[PDB]
Design a protein around this nucleic acid. Sequence first.
DNA 1: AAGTTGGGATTGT
DNA 2: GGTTAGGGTGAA
DNA 3: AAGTTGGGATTGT
DNA 4: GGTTAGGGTGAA
DNA 5: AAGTTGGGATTGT
DNA 6: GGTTAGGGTGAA
DNA 7: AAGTTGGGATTGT
DNA 8: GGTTAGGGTGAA
Lengths: 199, 199, 199, 199
Amino acid sequence: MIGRLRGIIIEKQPPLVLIEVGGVGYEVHMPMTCFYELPEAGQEAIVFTHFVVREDAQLLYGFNNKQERTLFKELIKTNGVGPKLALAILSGMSAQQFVNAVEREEVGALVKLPGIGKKTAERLIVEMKDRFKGLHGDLFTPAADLVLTSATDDAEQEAVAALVALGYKPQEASRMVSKIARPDASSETLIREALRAAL
Amino acid sequence: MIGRLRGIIIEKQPPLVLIEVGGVGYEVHMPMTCFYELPEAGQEAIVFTHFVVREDAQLLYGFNNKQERTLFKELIKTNGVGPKLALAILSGMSAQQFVNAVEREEVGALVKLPGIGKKTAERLIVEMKDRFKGLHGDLFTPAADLVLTSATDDAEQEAVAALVALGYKPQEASRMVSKIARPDASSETLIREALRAAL
Amino acid sequence: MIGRLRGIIIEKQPPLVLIEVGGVGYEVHMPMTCFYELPEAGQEAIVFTHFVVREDAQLLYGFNNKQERTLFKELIKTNGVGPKLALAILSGMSAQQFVNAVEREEVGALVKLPGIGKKTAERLIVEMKDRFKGLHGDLFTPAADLVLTSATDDAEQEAVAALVALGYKPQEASRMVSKIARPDASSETLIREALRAAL
Amino acid sequence: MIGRLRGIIIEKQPPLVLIEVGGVGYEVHMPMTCFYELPEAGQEAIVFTHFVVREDAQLLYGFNNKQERTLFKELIKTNGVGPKLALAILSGMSAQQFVNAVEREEVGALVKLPGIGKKTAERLIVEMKDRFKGLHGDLFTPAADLVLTSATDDAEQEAVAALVALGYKPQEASRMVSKIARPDASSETLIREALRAAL
DNA sequence: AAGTTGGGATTGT
DNA sequence: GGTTAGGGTGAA
DNA sequence: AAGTTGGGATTGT
DNA sequence: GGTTAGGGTGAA
DNA sequence: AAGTTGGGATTGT
DNA sequence: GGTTAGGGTGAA
DNA sequence: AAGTTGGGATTGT
DNA sequence: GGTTAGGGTGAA
């Protein structure tokens, strides 16, 4: 529900920051590699956040980049992996270092991670690979999370994304968009013709 | 609890917008037909919202118009239908297009919707019809949600609404208000004489 | 957790108001007798609130006066009575009218209330009486909620209140404070000597 | 999630304060010894908070000092002890008085506490001792909560803290940091070499 | 060294 | 809360 | 009119 | 979700 | 005085 | 919600 | 083509 | 979590 926080860094107790937005100071759990980039205390920060709601607790996970947030969101989906593991994962190695490891099948590095033996280690590199690359090694090539989250147009990605939010199966979503063939239209325009055609 | 959000559109990833209110950026899930009307990023937006609270998650559903929110709230009440379906429903066709379909029994269109076969399709048009019309085809004739939500006075509608919030049965609420016969009094005044008479 | 809301009245749909605080518009459920006192839309309002948190939902109940909030909080404690009943209760009759009815055992009036037959009706007047009066008929004589919530000093009341928040039994709390005999000290000072003596 | 509140003290009803931050007034439950230090009403206050989320309720616990918050957080961990007991505990005696009692095994004082007989009394002094002292009697010697929460460097403490947040066992965390031997580096730098070495 | 018996633990239900 | 992994210890 | 058999419903668990 | 009241309807 | 039988209650599940 | 403490009352 | 056997899935509990 | 729909695939 909370997607981003923008306020003054009041305090730093890794892995958590205390950012004041208005008069309310929120606690944000951030991966060490991200934390290293937080501006000095007293400075204003902007951090994308993944909000977690439990029956007994509700925490905030933050990242400096949307891509970073996305990778983390995909990581948590992975079986056996939750907020804590992903956090540890992104403290030992950076979003890049991870991409790299999964596309270079550097299991070793992943295993030595606290709480992550061969089993999940492999799971990661497996469930994660496919998604990557479109990235072509760089985690910041354009529309990186569309890539992760959904190489064809940026707007087509976005549209396939949305169609899948609406219930269409991914095959369906893709085929549905391309049938339209218009990489140079607004992602909303595609989402719109596509729909109009589906029904 | 949250009934409206007013802030700067920070980002757009259909179907969700990221609106910053103060320093907090809220994620809002909006039907594609609504989304199409959102001002450019950077602009200020005002979106009525339906807040959903689960044990494991709490999301925000937004609409450009109160009527739009109301229709959605009625849709979710419908059996087999929840936030996601209604969202899809209002992405394939607009509040109007829906009204139209239910009052013209255009099942076809509804069936082709992702996740909505004949069964719920019919349920919709059935449970929804009665409520409509007072609307007389237009979704924006005056006090449209009173119509949906509760053709006699605007204040009588509102009052019957409230009386039903308090526990009176709808028959009761209606008869109770009209007994007062004063379409030209404040909805609060009716709610007030009515009560005074009931007790 | 939320104890008060202060913002601009954006809209009125009895029994709920939509007050904007900053950029966030909160929905507040208020008893009709209270609602009648809300300033015009567009004006700024201040409303004490009772926050309700469920597994499937979290609403806000508001009152113009702390006393009004207190009475409602005591009402909800009453067995068989919850937010909705109390709301109805305070829509049919005012905090005064209620006090009056309980201290004049006007069951009749209470029974005719929607959802409140003889059974709870009596329960009310029973569980509520004792608490009242110190009030001496007026709901706004000084420190009315201390009265309800905890005729001796205002500070002694407050202190007995706190001691009971800490685990002391009410008998204990009272006797403990008076032993101190100092109606003219700060409620905090009493809470402080009292404690110091208990341990 | 909420780690601090900064606003205007709107009202005082010990043990709870009503602080307005922006337009929202939050209720904060504070131990009497802390409460005694709150500035006059109308003044601005800053209070560290421990946010509690239940299925049926979500309250805010506040303290004037981070150390005070930390002690309370450790207290709640203690078996048989929860927010209420700790609150009572810190109403009868101050963070100091407590430290003192645990390091001087003043069971007596603890027993007389409402709800705290010999059983938990001992538990406290037992589970709490070890943690203390590094404190050397004073609760405000530098990095007191690192002490409580994690006498070697401030940055090493912090780093061991973080490593333990990530899943490393405390033995592991400690040994891991010292192996680095660099009390004069940033806690982040340690967390960083340490990790780099672990993997 | 390689498999096993267990306590601990977020994860998933 | 039960269950699956984690990764520790003991066995062969 | 007085008690009873039931569907509906917030309340309480 | 089960359970207690509410207050409707039918019985006597 | 010392142990026991119970109602009450946050705590822990 | 069940369970463990709390601390009250009654027993010996 | 029409009914059936199943995996998937929000919905409802 | 169990359950009802959804809508896929296979059968006749």
